[PDB]
Amino acid sequence: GSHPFDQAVVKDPTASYVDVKARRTFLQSGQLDDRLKAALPKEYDCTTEATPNPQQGEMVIPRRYLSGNHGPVNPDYEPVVTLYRDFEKISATLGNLYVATGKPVYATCLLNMLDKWAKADALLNYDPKSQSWYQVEWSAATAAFALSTMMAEPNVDTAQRERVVKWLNRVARHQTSFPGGDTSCCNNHSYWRGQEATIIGVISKDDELFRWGLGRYVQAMGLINEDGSFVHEMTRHEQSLHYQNYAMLPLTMIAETASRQGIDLYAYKENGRDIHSARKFVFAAVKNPDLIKKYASEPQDTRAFKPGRGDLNWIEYQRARFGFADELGFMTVPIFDPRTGGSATLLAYKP
Numbered sequence: 001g002s003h004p005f006d007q008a009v010v011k012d013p014t015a016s017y018v019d020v021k022a023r024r025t026f027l028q029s030g031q032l033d034d035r036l037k038a039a040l041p042k043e044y045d046c047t048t049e050a051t052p053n054p055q056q057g058e059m060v061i062p063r064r065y066l067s068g069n070h071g072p073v074n075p076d077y078e079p080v081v082t083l084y085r086d087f088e089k090i091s092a093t094l095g096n097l098y099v100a101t102g103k104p105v106y107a108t109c110l111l112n113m114l115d116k117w118a119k120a121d122a123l124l125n126y127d128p129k130s131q132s133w134y135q136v137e138w139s140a141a142t143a144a145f146a147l148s149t150m151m152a153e154p155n156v157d158t159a160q161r162e163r164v165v166k167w168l169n170r171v172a173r174h175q176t177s178f179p180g181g182d183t184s185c186c187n188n189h190s191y192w193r194g195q196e197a198t199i200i201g202v203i204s205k206d207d208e209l210f211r212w213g214l215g216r217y218v219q220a221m222g223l224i225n226e227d228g229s230f231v232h233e234m235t236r237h238e239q240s241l242h243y244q245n246y247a248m249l250p251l252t253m254i255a256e257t258a259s260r261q262g263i264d265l266y267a268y269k270e271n272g273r274d275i276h277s278a279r280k281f282v283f284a285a286v287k288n289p290d291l292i293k294k295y296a297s298e299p300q301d302t303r304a305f306k307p308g309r310g311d312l313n314w315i316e317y318q319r320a321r322f323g324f325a326d327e328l329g330f331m332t333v334p335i336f337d338p339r340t341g342g343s344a345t346l347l348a349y350k351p
């Protein structure tokens with residue numbers, strides 16, 4: 001690819017994106033404050049519950065509107081996207097339960113679900129020019145994050161785990177083989193493809209994929225403005241602040257994942273700008289929305305900046321590592337986001 005980390009190697013395929021053993025221990029012995037307590041997943045008998053089935057044949061995400069970008073809604077849209085969002089929610093929940101309890105039963109449930117999708121060759125047949133391309137990057141990563149926490153679990157069908165891992169590896173290699181257009185080549189989608197390749201590169205011990213993934217993080221650092229804003233996200237009008245925050249989600253996971261492999265991505269800078277510059281801009285723009293006026297004149301949609309929104313999951317990981325202050329008071333209720341490993345409060349928050 002040609003970047004400072006084009007020779008990086010996958011050191012340990014079972015390292016995951018957090019220290020599972022150590023975190024489980026803290027959750028089982030330590031004294032959890034009210035916030036952490038509220039984040040504990042509720043146990044359930046997953047062995048007798050069926051999960052979403054994969055679409056058969058070609059993967060097609062219907063258009064949201066019968067025609068154009070607005071107006072009459074397409075009734076086929078809701079049922080199809082829900083199928084994927086349920087798949088992602090269940091995958092992340094089982095991953096989080098396995099971390100918190102350590103019970104092999106949750107790993108068995110996850111594998112049974114994923115084996116169903118692998119056998120059907122899901123997330124592989126689609127038009128790369130359609131919405132399906134984006135749906136794949138989110139769903140493959142979500143399942144990969146959950147599975148990465150149980151790569152060292154001995155009490156599970158090992159042949160089944162191998163089949164699933166090969167499947168995810170195929171899914172990621174195919175999805176990232178497409179370049180994307182003038183924006184999707186290099187905006188937050190590039191970073192989502194980045195976290196997908198990184199976590200799957202690690203569990204499938206595929207150094208080439210792992211390297212390609214780290215390369216998206218590098219690409220992003222060079223697309224940061226003097227004030228910490230992302231070049232491509234500041235072109236989204238009333239959604240500019242939303243996308244600035246959104247891009248922080250996958251970039252944070254690539255860095256957290258790389259860190260468990262002995263690589264310090266967070267320390268990587270380009271022209272006096274790094275990921276911290278981006279974090280500081282998000283916090284400053286939420287306090288003073290006038291800063292966005294240099295890029296867009298429209299009033300900003302701030303739906304993502306409410307306590308409890310999954311969009312804030314990246315703050316739990318970064319705060320746990322760097323210890324900066326919660327300036328905006330966002331970290332009150334627990335946060336859960338399937339696409340960035342489930343509950344960051346459960347997996348990283350340390351009172």
Ligand SMILES: O=C(O)C1=C[C@H](O)[C@H](O)[C@H](O[C@H]2[C@H](O)[C@H](O)[C@H](O[C@H]3[C@H](O)[C@H](O)[C@H](O)O[C@@H]3C(=O)O)O[C@@H]2C(=O)O)O1
Binds near residue numbers: 308309311
């Ligand atoms: O995370 C929440 O707590 C949150 C609560 C809400 O009431 C909604 O259910 C909200 O939905 C999210 C959803 O979880 C995804 O994050 C979705 O992601 C979209 C991105 O925001 C971009 O628009 C991207 O281009 O498309 C993504 C997609 O289509 O999945 O955003 C919604 C939302 O913000 O409404 O979650």
